[PDB]
Design a protein around this ligand. Structure first.
Ligand SMILES: *C(=S)NCCc1ccc(O)cc1
Ligand SMILES: *C(=S)NCCc1ccc(O)cc1
Ligand SMILES: *C(=S)NCCc1ccc(O)cc1
Ligand SMILES: [Cl-]
Ligand SMILES: [Cl-]
Lengths: 114, 114, 114
């Protein structure tokens, strides 16, 4: 998978080790090798959630497979947990968009995964 | 819905109250409660539209339902109108990508909307 | 099409002509006039790829048509080639997500392409 977080929380509030923690937690949650996992954190963003500029986050998880009703609930618990714990963002001010990608629609190293 | 706009217009050109207006107008357009609407504005971007660096924007609207032929035309008129009037971006230099999300693929508050 | 690249490469390492080069090369690759094509480059990002913070890129290509198994394999070579030469990114540290958009879900100039 690849995971992206966009947040209005300032850069300094992102803990050293946060990217590594996301990488390892996603490897465990998906059973994928950490070697292929990509993570991306974007702080200091100009955002509102419900018209409020309190801490919030907009996220996405793209994966080839391993996306579904029950799996997505488990990811959401895991990822909101991390965002609460590490960035002090309330879970009800987080959206996570899940994308089940066709392998032919993911390019890597001069080809696709198909 | 969640609405993201990326633009090369500088931050100083984003008027006070713009995120509030987007929230309010998207609530009216979709009939959804403003309390659930998220908005994200990213100025000062390195962008080109048709090989020109004149003011432009690339946007996305994700919604669970409320996405379709006529609805999307109505959203485009609204949102291009706002980008023109408030950010001084010509409508012919705006793209907006619309996404109809399955509730099972949207995480929020430690769970998903499924 | 529209092309977005997010990268941890610093802004000063992004050549001034990169957006125009991408525009022109994509126009040739897709058979579309360059005036239609939009490009967005986001440097200085906090990213990890396989647990490493060496230069990397996460990209997307959206297009109305011109997306499919063979076409995507070809785009991947084109884009890995440009990112490798101009941004000095190893091609095995690039992901490109491909999206085939419905014309009714792409807004432009107060309307949609449908
Ligand atoms: C997890 S193993 N990610 C690496 C493969 C991948 C899957 C989905 C997308 O969009 C990019 C890369
Ligand atoms: C508008 S009411 N948004 C809240 C629900 C939602 C819909 C779609 C996505 O991607 C996130 C959240
Ligand atoms: C290439 S000709 N792009 C212009 C039309 C377009 C296609 C797809 C998306 O997402 C935006 C614009
Ligand atoms: Cl699976
Ligand atoms: Cl086609």
């Amino acid at each position: 998978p690849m995971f992206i977080v966009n947040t209005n929380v300032p850069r300094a509030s992102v803990p050293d080790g946060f990217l590594s923690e996301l990488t390892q937690q996603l490897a465990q949650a998906t059973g994928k090798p950490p070697q292929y996992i990509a993570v991306h954190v974007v702080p200091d963003q100009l955002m509102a959630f419900g018209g409020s500029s309190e801490p919030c986050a907009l996220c996405s998880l793209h994966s080839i497979g391993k996306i579904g009703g029950a799996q997505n609930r488990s990811y959401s618990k895991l990822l909101c947990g991390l965002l609460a714990e590490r960035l002090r963002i309330s879970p009800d001010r987080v959206y996570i968009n899940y994308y089940d990608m066709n392998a032919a629609n993911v390019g890597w190293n001069n080809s696709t995964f198909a």
